[PDB]
Amino acid sequence: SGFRKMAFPSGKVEGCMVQVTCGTTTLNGLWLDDVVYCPRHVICTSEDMLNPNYEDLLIRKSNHNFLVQAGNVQLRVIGHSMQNCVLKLKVDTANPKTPKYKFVRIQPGQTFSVLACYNGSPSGVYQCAMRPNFTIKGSFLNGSCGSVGFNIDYDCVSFCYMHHMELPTGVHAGTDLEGNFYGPFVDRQTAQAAGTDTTITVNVLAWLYAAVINGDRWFLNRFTTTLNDFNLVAMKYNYEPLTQDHVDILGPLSAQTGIAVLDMCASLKELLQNGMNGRTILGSALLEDEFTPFDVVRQCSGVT
Amino acid sequence: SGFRKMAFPSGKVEGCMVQVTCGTTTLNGLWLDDVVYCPRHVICTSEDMLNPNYEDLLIRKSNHNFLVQAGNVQLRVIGHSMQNCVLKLKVDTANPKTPKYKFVRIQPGQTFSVLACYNGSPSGVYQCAMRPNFTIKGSFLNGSCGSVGFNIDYDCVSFCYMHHMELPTGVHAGTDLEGNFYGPFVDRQTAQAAGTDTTITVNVLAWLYAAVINGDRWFLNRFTTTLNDFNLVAMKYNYEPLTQDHVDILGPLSAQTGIAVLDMCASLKELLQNGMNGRTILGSALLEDEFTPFDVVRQCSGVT
Ligand SMILES: *CC(=O)N1CCN(Cc2cccs2)CC1
Ligand SMILES: *CC(=O)N1CCN(Cc2cccs2)CC1
Numbered sequence: 001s002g003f004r005k006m007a008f009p010s011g012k013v014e015g016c017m018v019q020v021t022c023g024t025t026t027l028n029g030l031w032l033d034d035v036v037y038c039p040r041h042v043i044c045t046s047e048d049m050l051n052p053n054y055e056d057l058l059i060r061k062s063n064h065n066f067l068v069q070a071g072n073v074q075l076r077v078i079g080h081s082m083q084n085c086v087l088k089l090k091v092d093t094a095n096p097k098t099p100k101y102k103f104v105r106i107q108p109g110q111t112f113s114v115l116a117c118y119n120g121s122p123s124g125v126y127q128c129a130m131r132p133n134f135t136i137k138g139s140f141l142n143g144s145c146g147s148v149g150f151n152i153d154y155d156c157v158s159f160c161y162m163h164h165m166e167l168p169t170g171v172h173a174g175t176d177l178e179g180n181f182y183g184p185f186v187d188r189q190t191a192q193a194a195g196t197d198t199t200i201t202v203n204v205l206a207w208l209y210a211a212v213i214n215g216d217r218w219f220l221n222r223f224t225t226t227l228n229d230f231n232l233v234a235m236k237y238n239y240e241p242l243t244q245d246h247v248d249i250l251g252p253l254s255a256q257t258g259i260a261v262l263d264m265c266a267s268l269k270e271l272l273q274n275g276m277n278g279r280t281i282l283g284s285a286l287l288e289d290e291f292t293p294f295d296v297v298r299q300c301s302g303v304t
Numbered sequence: 305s306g307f308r309k310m311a312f313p314s315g316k317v318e319g320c321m322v323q324v325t326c327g328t329t330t331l332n333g334l335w336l337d338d339v340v341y342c343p344r345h346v347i348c349t350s351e352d353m354l355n356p357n358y359e360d361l362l363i364r365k366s367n368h369n370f371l372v373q374a375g376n377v378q379l380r381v382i383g384h385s386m387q388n389c390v391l392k393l394k395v396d397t398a399n400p401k402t403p404k405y406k407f408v409r410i411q412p413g414q415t416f417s418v419l420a421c422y423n424g425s426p427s428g429v430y431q432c433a434m435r436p437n438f439t440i441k442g443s444f445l446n447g448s449c450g451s452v453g454f455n456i457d458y459d460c461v462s463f464c465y466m467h468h469m470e471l472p473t474g475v476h477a478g479t480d481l482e483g484n485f486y487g488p489f490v491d492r493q494t495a496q497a498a499g500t501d502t503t504i505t506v507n508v509l510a511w512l513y514a515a516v517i518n519g520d521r522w523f524l525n526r527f528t529t530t531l532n533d534f535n536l537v538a539m540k541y542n543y544e545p546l547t548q549d550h551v552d553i554l555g556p557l558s559a560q561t562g563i564a565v566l567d568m569c570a571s572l573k574e575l576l577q578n579g580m581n582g583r584t585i586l587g588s589a590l591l592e593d594e595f596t597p598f599d600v601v602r603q604c605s606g607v608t
Contacts, residue, residue, distance in 0.1 A: 001474045004443040006428035009419060011315030115313060121608035124310035125429055137587065139308040141606045170305045170519055215474055276589075278579075283441065285580075285589030302445045304425035 003210045003282050005290070006299055007113035008152045010125045015097030018075065019120030020089070020146065021067040028117045028146030029068060029089070030159065030177070032098050036068050036075070036089040037177060038146045039164045040082055041187050049189040058082055063089075069120060070095075084179030085187050086162065100156040103177035108132045109200040109240070111292050112149040112160050116140060128161075129203070129290040132240055133195040134183025135171040136161070149174075154304075167192055199239045199289050202246040205264050206293040209253035211281045213300055219281060220259070223266035230265040237272045249293045256300075307514045307586050309594070310603055311417035312456045314429045319401030322379065323424030324393070324450065325371040332421045332450030333372060333393070334463065334481070336402050340372050340379070340393040341481060342450045343468045344386055345491050353493040362386055367393075373424060374399075388483030389491050390466065404460040407481035412436045413504040413544070415596050416453040416464050420444060432465075433507070433594040436544055437499040438487025439475040440465070453478075458608075471496055503543045503593050506550040509568050510597040513557035515585045517604055523585060524563070527570035534569040541576045553597045560604075 020029040020038045029038035043057050066089050068075040079090030111129045115122050128136045140163055149161025164187050165173040171194055173185035185192055231241045247261045254261050276285055324333040324342045333342035347361050370393050372379040383394030415433045419426050432440045444467055453465025468491050469477040475498055477489035489496055535545045551565045558565050580589055
């Protein structure tokens with residue numbers, strides 16, 4: 001028992017982190033097979049970041065200008081190309097620690113682990129979610145760019161995020177491993193404001209199921225609701241509308257606990273309207289929305 | 305910017321996890337050099353757990369009865385001994401992935417990362433603190449015992465915890481790597497109740513400093529207090545008394561932010577007496593106490 005914000009074991013990803021330096025700029029790169037992936041803004045000076053023309057800036061860079069270092073050993077760059085907002089640096093050596101991997105582009109509401117790195121060296125691992133406004137709430141200082149987000153399915157790492165930017169509001173923006181940003185963000189030092197950070201309703205319900213499984217049951221009530229009635233309340237509280245697809249995904253949690261999804265919706269509706277009244281659920285005083293239904297099942301069953 | 309509950313990268317510890325089976329019982333073991341460490345309750349049947357006499361039960365076990373498997377390869381057990389509540393199984397092969405390591409016994413208030421494992425296989429990593437009542441609030445199902453808690457200082461892993469038990473209240477108890485339990489807990493299926501889970505005051509203040517560094521400043525007020533005045537409030541709210549040692553440890557955070565430790569104490573005092581009023585600090589609606597002053601400095605500076 002017990003329920004924690006848990007990240008995937010990071011070892012498989014630690015074996016892929018390298019340092020990439022171009023001129024005076026240093027960030028992280030992801031070494032998979034004979035390719036090192038990194039944000040294209042590694043070619044920029046802080047002055048270039050104002051209105052960069054990446055294709056033009058890249059013309060002034062040759063293979064020998066990209067310094068790639070894995071631990072204390074240098075990798076030889078034999079090619080470079082730009083794909084959207086990432087650079088792909090072909091090196092002459094395949095990463096011997098390359099795990100089974102995939103590049104996936106996640107949807108908002110999906111969670112992942114981040115291995116925050118500086119100078120190609122891992123500093124820590126934490127769990128994130130792709131917010132409905134396509135930002136993530138991470139922990140990233142200067143030098144952390146190129147750190148990646150991932151999920152693991154037994155022995156295959158699905159990389160889903162690469163860190164590129166911090167908005168003036170302290171929230172983060174990045175790309176998938178094809179270099180396409182999540183949301184409307186651009187790799188430029190300009191005014192970029194995030195939209196409404198709505199709450200991921202299906203995740204809150206999954207977390208309420210985890211609370212019941214782990215003994216926290218005070219919030220269970222004698223009520224039920226419908227999807228349409230619940231959604232009137234979800235609209236008022238800036239929660240994502242709940243769909244039948246979300247109800248279907250909560251099926252296994254409903255089956256395990258014996259609590260119908262719409263009854264859990266009614267508990268969530270009372271929690272939104274009445275508040276917590278100074279009480280906690282799984283050690284939290286707010287409704288947690290960065291656990292998906294799959295994360296709850298995984299943690300509650302002990303998948304390795 | 306951004307501040308997250310961050311665990312250490314787990315790779316160094318993943319390389320040490322093995323499965324240990326004795327009879328019909330399977331849990332995790334920690335393989336360092338040619339020794340595998342695991343909870344001594346691996347020798348028990350659920351029936352033995354009621355009132356086990358470990359020295360007597362161990363007499364019926366020989367080296368060949370301890371099945372140790374690292375991945376899909378079996379390790380040969382050439383010796384076994386009991387040290388307090390852990391068994392040390394000497395194997396004929398040194399773990400080639402043994403990192404630089406130390407065994408440390410932590411104090412309450414200290415934080416650490418847990419690599420939750422099942423059948424010697426890592427499932428996830430999360431951050432914990434040794435509570436003032438010597439329990440930890442983890443996420444551990446049957447089979448998770450033998451999972452370890454650790455801190456890393458650059459390339460040396462300091463192992464501080466090994467999972468052994470879950471109390472009826474859903475909280476966890478375990479030992480250091482010498483087999484001595486934290487607190488008064490015993491490895492027996494008996495009535496064991498935890499004492500008051502008081503809040504780690506110095507950790508809350510460190511986290512308030514992290515909030516100011518990361519932009520959350522609404523709780524800063526025009527007041528100050530003394531250690532004795534603050535402690536009258538800390539007593540009322542089940543917070544640990546603050547000492548001059550704690551004030552000294554907060555020195556670097558005070559220096560960085562320009563906020564005197566006693567002024568931050570006064571902010572915390574108002575937060576305790578007035579509550580949050582529906583507001584949040586670093587995405588939390590309660591005062592977080594599982595970040596030490598050292599964790600805050602580490603995360604805010606990017607130590608790898
Ligand atoms: C994440 C990180 O390391 N940095 C340093 C480089 N910086 C370049 C810029 C991208 C957009 C505007 S400036 C991003 C943050
Ligand atoms: C943590 C874990 O794997 N388990 C299974 C074995 N169980 C034995 C007992 C220890 C004290 C009472 S029963 C502990 C939990």
